[PDB]
Structure 1
Amino acid sequence: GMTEYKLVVVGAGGVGKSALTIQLIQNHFVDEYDPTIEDSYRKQVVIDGETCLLDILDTAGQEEYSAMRDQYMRTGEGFLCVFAINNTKSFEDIHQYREQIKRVKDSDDVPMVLVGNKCDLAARTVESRQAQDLARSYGIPYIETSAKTRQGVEDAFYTLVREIRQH
């Protein structure tokens, strides 16, 4: 049948990372969620005219279980590496997430996207040029998203699927 893509969200905690998958998967248009329901993290979508199933792993809230990162990352085919645009430390953490994904996957060329997330109205401290330059240094796309308006959210996940398809 249709292709299933196993996508994994990684990134610092405490800075609204979970809004990316929630807004995707949501009833886009009813602001509501029960994460405990069976397949609150599976979504059938059409990308460039080809239907597929996204299975998204987002372990937001488990960041302190730092020795489980490999156990969780090993499940994934593509990765969203998320930082918050008002949290410079979360941006600085990206390099190490990327190194750990390369190590678990035993590959220098794992499908991944860099995502800069706007999780509140607090002042931005990472400029888009800084994040574009980082993404370009890694050879991966950069997408910015809003945690409140759903802007950028479909682009982040669809861009990752395109990276997998074109790998």
Structure 2
Amino acid sequence: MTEYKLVVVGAGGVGKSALTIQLIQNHFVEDSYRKQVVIDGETCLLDILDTAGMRDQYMRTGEGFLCVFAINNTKSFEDIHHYREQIKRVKDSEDVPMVLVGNKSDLPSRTVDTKQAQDLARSYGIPFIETSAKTRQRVEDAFYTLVREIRQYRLK
């Protein structure tokens, strides 16, 4: 049974922990969690690390990264450059499985346009998904897309 190490990264308060607990407990609220899931007929064990805003070690061990910003926090969006740069430096590769996640999609105070984030994700060559840990909207899609990015990378 294939095991995938997933790391959730992003600035303080963007909802890294809320996203992880929504995937695990299906509830809106340890730093590591495990969950066996079936994606495209293949069984796998997701091993998920929740981080703070061991850094080089988790960036080396992580197979895929959820780079999370909050749609109401422009600094958290700008700071994605910093998380993507540190990951690429440690992995010594311009190709690392990553998904850009715009969290708090439920909130009315949006300061980052969906279009702005989509264009950035297109510049990075990674998927972009808007999520809400509060309503569970696209939370599975974000983690499962990341597992699909790791599998596609493993066929390279």
Q: Offset at 1:39?
A: 9.6
Q: Distance in 2 between matches of 1:120 and 1:132?
A: 18
1:47 corresponds in structure 2 to 39
Contact 2:32 2:47 in 1 (8 A): no
1:99 corresponds in structure 2 to 85
- Pair 1:40–1:27, CA change in 2 (3 A): farther
Aligned length: 153
Q: Offset at 1:40?
A: 6.3
Task: Work out whether 1:10 is the aligned partner of 2:9.
Answer: yes
Q: Offset at 1:19?
A: 1.0
2:50 corresponds in structure 1 to 58
Q: Offset at 1:74?
A: 1.9
Q: Distance in 2 between matches of 1:158 and 1:15?
A: 20
Query: What residue ranges of structure 1 are gaps of 5+ in the alignment?
Result: 31-37, 62-67
Query: What residue ranges of structure 2 are gaps of 5+ in the alignment?
Result: none
- Pair 1:50–1:91, CA change in 2 (3 A): same
Q: Distance in 2 between matches of 1:120 and 1:129?
A: 17
- Pair 1:39–1:101, CA change in 2 (3 A): closer
Bigger proportion of residues as helix? 2
Deviations 1:92-130 (A, max 9, x none): 000111011001111110000000001763500001000
Q: Offset at 1:21?
A: 0.6
Calculate the TM-score normalised by the size of structure 1: 0.84
Q: Which moved more, 1:3-12 or 1:15-24?
A: 15-24
Runs of 4+ in 1 over 6 A off after TM superposition: none
Tell me the C-alpha RMSD between the 2 structures.
2.1
Deviations 1:3-52 (A, max 9, x none): 0000001100123221111100115599xxxxxxx896100001011110
Contact 1:18 1:60 in 2 (8 A): no
Contact 1:113 1:142 in 2 (8 A): yes
Q: Offset at 1:73?
A: 1.7
Calculate the TM-score normalised by the size of structure 2: 0.90
Contact 1:12 1:82 in 2 (8 A): yes
- Residue identity over aligned pairs, in percent, reads 93
Contact 1:46 1:52 in 2 (8 A): yes
Contact 1:119 1:148 in 2 (8 A): no
Q: Distance in 2 between matches of 1:16 and 1:154?
A: 15
* Secondary structure, aligned partner of 1:74: helix
Deviations 1:116-152 (A, max 9, x none): 0017635000010000000000000001100211111
Contact 1:79 1:113 in 2 (8 A): yes
Q: Distance in 2 between matches of 1:58 and 1:29?
A: 15
Q: Distance in 1 between matches of 2:103 and 2:39?
A: 22
